Design a protein around this ligand. Structure first.
Ligand SMILES: N[C@]12C[C@H]3C[C@H](C[C@H](C3)C1)C2
Lengths: 25, 25, 25, 25
């Protein structure tokens, strides 16, 4: 495993991408 | 701990998310 | 190498940048 | 040091923030 801030941030940068893309569509 | 660029960047990707979301609302 | 979530996220933050920039233009 | 993809990505997430903020203003 890695540290929970690093991992958490990673997931965020995925979720925030979907939201942004969804908004555009 | 980790390195301050890595950690700092992590926090940014959270703050930038809130700002973006807040703007949408 | 590093872990595939970390690396994958890195690439995303690049692709998402291009898309955003392209949209602005 | 860390790996150049990780570091590079970190900087990007800062630059992309400024650009986004500047655009809003
Ligand atoms: N946006 C990023 C969040 C976190 C730190 C850095 C590298 C990875 C993980 C993607 C920038």
């Amino acid at each position: 495993s890695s540290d929970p801030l690093v991992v958490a941030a990673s997931i965020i940068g995925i979720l925030h991408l979907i939201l942004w893309i969804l908004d555009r569509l």
